Amino acid sequence: GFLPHFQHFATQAIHVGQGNPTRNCLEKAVAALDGAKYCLAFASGLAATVTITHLLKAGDQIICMDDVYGGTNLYFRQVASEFGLKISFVDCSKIKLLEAAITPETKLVWIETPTNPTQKVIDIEGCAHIVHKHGDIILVVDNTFMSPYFQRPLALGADISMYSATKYMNGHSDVVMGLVSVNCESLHNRLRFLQNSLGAVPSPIDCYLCNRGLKTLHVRMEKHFKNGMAVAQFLESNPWVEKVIYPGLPSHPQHELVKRQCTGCTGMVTFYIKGTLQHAEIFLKNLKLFTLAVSLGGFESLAELPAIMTLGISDTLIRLSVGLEDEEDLLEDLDQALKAAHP
Amino acid sequence: GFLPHFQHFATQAIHVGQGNPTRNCLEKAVAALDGAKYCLAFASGLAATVTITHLLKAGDQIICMDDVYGGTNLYFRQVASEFGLKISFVDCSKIKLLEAAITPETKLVWIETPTNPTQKVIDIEGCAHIVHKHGDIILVVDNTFMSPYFQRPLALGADISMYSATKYMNGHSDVVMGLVSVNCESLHNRLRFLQNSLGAVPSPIDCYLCNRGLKTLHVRMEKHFKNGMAVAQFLESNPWVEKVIYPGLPSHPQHELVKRQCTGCTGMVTFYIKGTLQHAEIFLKNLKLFTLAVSLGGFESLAELPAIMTLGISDTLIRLSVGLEDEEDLLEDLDQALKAAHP
Amino acid sequence: GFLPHFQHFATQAIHVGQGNPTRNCLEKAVAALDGAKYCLAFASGLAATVTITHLLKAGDQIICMDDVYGGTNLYFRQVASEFGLKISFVDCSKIKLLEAAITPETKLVWIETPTNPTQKVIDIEGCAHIVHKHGDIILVVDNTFMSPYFQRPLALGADISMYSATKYMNGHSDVVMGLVSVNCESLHNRLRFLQNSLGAVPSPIDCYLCNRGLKTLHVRMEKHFKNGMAVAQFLESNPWVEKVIYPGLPSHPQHELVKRQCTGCTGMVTFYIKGTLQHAEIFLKNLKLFTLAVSLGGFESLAELPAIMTLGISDTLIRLSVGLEDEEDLLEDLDQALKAAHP
Amino acid sequence: GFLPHFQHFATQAIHVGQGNPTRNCLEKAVAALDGAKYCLAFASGLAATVTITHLLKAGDQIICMDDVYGGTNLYFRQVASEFGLKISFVDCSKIKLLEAAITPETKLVWIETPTNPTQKVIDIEGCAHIVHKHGDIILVVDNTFMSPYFQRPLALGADISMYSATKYMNGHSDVVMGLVSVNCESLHNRLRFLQNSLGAVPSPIDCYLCNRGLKTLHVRMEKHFKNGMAVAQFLESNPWVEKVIYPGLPSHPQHELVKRQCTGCTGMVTFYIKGTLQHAEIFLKNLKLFTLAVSLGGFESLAELPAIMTLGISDTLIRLSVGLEDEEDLLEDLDQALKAAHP
């Protein structure tokens, strides 16, 4: 059994909110969903990330969750380099390694769960209890790969929960957002000053369309979960799949952590096709419903071979972003394409 | 057990469609959801209704489902009067009355299910075989009060399935539509000619935003059903409620028909408060989450006393349009307000 | 000297307006611009036309301005045929012919000025004094080819001024409208009843975006006029142009009427290239700035050979819709392409 | 005589442009209008300003045009303080003071023309040769108070031309932008890196709606100029006005520079009412067409008493943002209100 879904969530998304009034209402809304007293809207998740780092001073160290196969490590390096900050990347799925890597100059720790695309799950409050045991170190959790609907990092010990809205989310509505939620009273003040004085803020239209999208997040994510679960279960029992990686499955090496840390899972399913690279690539060309794309989220089910679209990652590793179509149609498409790769 | 949900529905809404290209894609999409070969988009449900009547000639008779407590009878009278047509209103929930009322001048039969607000359920395929047993008579079903997701009138024997989109629907997006689906190819041709020659058509923006809304109709209506079900069940077992009218409940006099005719029910719940008019009106002003409105649909739960907001209808009859908030929050609001009316 | 521009026009468009509140504000706004007490918004110009005809009774006759090379004659025939109306087409640029064609059954007269694409100008109040001398006959002027900014048919004697907004107007904003303005107190009432009872009405979004576009109509049309004038003048003095048709030029056979009937002209310029069909078609392929299109209006300058894109019309007749680009750039493109057709 | 309007401007805005395709097209378009090889879009003018400062290193000095009565000096102080930069404010309308204030640590010079609200005009090319005479110093001109249509700072010697789009601009369309144009290719490269690595960028929706607004900028600004000119001339010859400040008037102390530096002026007119503060405030409440607001731009004419709405500024100084209404209507409103303040 997972964590029970957060109370008043859907009610809050729909009713909460109903200077910059549109942004103010959005921040008021999101803060509720994040189980927070405060929230700040920025022009993008990246801009949100930069602002958070501006809380630090030259010489201070950041420790980041090591994103091996994603590209995000670069972006953090460029920011740290730009503002004279020390940075280090650690596999925080191994809680020892994090604790071992902390210095007295460590002031910020950044965490993504689950990781993309191999989906390792990081114990948030495990990390939080390690981070807060000595010194004052801000713990930030990138809450993008789950939603506020499935994961609440603030109620888990993190000091900051950042959610990045991309142009692909909510049926490809071209909304881009960096949403920073915090329960600390000093943190909100400093961030708020940074927000208004640096101007990295969304437009009123962005704020409106983002707020609008939130109102259907729960029913959307549920279907993502429902379909994802189905797709994962099907793939795992399929004779042409080596193995499957999906946090909602008991087969997942961190499944027990997931159930106590989250209320559900997204439509992001990773699996390993049997055979070599060229079965994986035949498979991809036989999909008639799944669309080939590197993006994440959306109403349409997406498929990706990260080994070719971006030591190297597995050529048999495939990452699906399961959409909102009929479960059967998805299963049938996968079944057909898998069969096409193994005559 | 209800009818199994229509296959490929969610897939179709999301993928089908992806002169007037935007309208063409919308009509192509909706036709799939309506289980139809053809669909036509008009500027409004009313304009769609007028167009359908233009299939007839002066002297031809229409027989309409008698909408007692709704206002719609007027609109049909005005149309019939305008174009020299005879019209008569019959309680078609009693199939007896319909067959008795058929004339050789009868050319069109109009049907709404369920009715508003007392929610009578009309046997569509019962009516369809009665209508098609002699003469050439078009049967039209107003499929607005259910969705194409819950009810498919074309697969039930009707010749025409009209869906009227209002601006309150899909989170109050200001989209207005008349959508006419038909499986007959002579019918489609005449309607298509009428459509392009009379100009009562939506704008490209309307078509786009309508098409966009369709892609989440299934997950939205499901939540409406889930919450509606919860609300209905709660009310019925509540000591301050005389009785409850909800097609999804076994207590409903047409429940068996519903399960055979539909795949589910909407968030429209009608019940009778105990006591007189003034408990009903105390109840309404103690609601803190439900919003007082005469409109139907939306993300927000609505409450209405039709006896005051429009032989007279019951002073104790209340009609709720249950939204997408958290089931618990709704139940508590209703529970609180009911007790507030009965010290 | 033309008629002085209508007073308070720009002020009205911007400030006037700042049931169906958005439509109500739009109708209030447009009525001011049309110099009217009343205005009604329909889903399209065609729907507006149909509604106007519904003022008539079976057997009543319509007399329409004969649109030879446009297609619109068909649409009127289909409507008249649909509702048992008698119809006749007369060259109303010859005022005698109109007066000669009036019957006691004549109840409606329809007029477009200027015509498309040969741009004959009809004397509105000449027609109005002929129409109103006996019987009660509604005179309607299709005020689409001019704007309310350049032409005010109600202040000229017409009983009804209809303006049709197409998806191409106001920088291709997908707004479609039928706007009917009237000063008569019986006419407005009947039309208003027809409007609300037949449902051929625009959406709130349509109404908003239409209202928004109006606020810049004056500065837009001015540039259309300014550029059009330049283009016309250039073409007429160009050695590869047989002759030019533009109401703003003294060379135009109805120029004197135009100046007393209008406050300016649009960007619609018609001219005859020297030589045969194949110089005209070479010319078209050498345009690098002008875009080949059959549509009318928009920010981009458009070119059309109606003889090929739709007794026959001239193969050397070309109709330009001059946009809002720099006058020189337009002139240079035309000069270059003309020179390319005559080595 | 002013500078001749920039060639191909209107053509470019309309046609140029027709990764992040929407932003790329916008930047491609704006660069043309700015007479630039390159342009970069940021989430806001303020974010654009911060990015530009990030070209500098701790210890480097900025010299800013001293914005006395505006608030902008604060924002620069906060930025400089945040990133360890020295800053100084100099009246650069007096070229004397600027040259005297240049240090070897001086790396950036910031300039606004005209100033708000007293409208000092700064000699851009005067400042540019002073700045570029020794050392490597970036000159930036805030080109917001004029448009790219009236002022081209890059063609005048500046290295960077920044245009800040506010949500009041283009008929209050909620678009917010920072647009940075540069002709240096080293400058563009560093800025481009900063742009993509810091994430302070607009959304696709922002870029689209901004790009859309550009297409009518020329015809809009012209009307602003035309009306502004009229308003200024009227006020100056009005017996209840002490004096008037408008760059388009020969009475303006920098008028000759203006004509050499610009192709026209905006709708921003500053004047001094006769009498004391209380005539100025009576005047404001008697305006029936002008709207009281502190914002700048829009379709509607605005009035502001900066002495009360924000050594102190004049109690009799009033700043108007003249809109797009009819010149006469504006003149009558001003005439009426002025007489209302002087019985």
Curated annotation (Swiss-Prot), chains A, B, C, D:
It is found in: Cytoplasm. Highly expressed in liver. Also in muscle and lower expression in most tissues except heart, pituitary gland, spleen, thymus, and vascular tissue, where it is hardly detected. It catalyses: L,L-cystathionine + H2O = 2-oxobutanoate + L-cysteine + NH4(+); L-cysteine + H2O = hydrogen sulfide + pyruvate + NH4(+) + H(+); L-homocysteine + H2O = 2-oxobutanoate + hydrogen sulfide + NH4(+) + H(+); L-homoserine = 2-oxobutanoate + NH4(+). Substrate binds at residues 69, 74, 294. The keyword Nuclease does not apply. One of its GO terms (biological process) is cysteine biosynthetic process via cystathionine. It is an enzyme of class 4 (lyase). It comes from the Eukaryota. Transmembrane segments: none annotated. GO terms for cellular component: cytoplasm; cytosol; extracellular exosome. Disulfide bonds: none annotated. The modification N6-(pyridoxal phosphate)lysine is found at residue 167. Gene3D superfamilies: Aspartate Aminotransferase, domain 1, Type I PLP-dependent aspartate aminotransferase-like (Major domain). Belongs to the trans-sulfuration enzymes family. It is linked to Cystathioninuria: Autosomal recessive phenotype characterized by abnormal accumulation of plasma cystathionine, leading to increased urinary excretion. This is Cystathionine gamma-lyase. It comes from Homo sapiens.
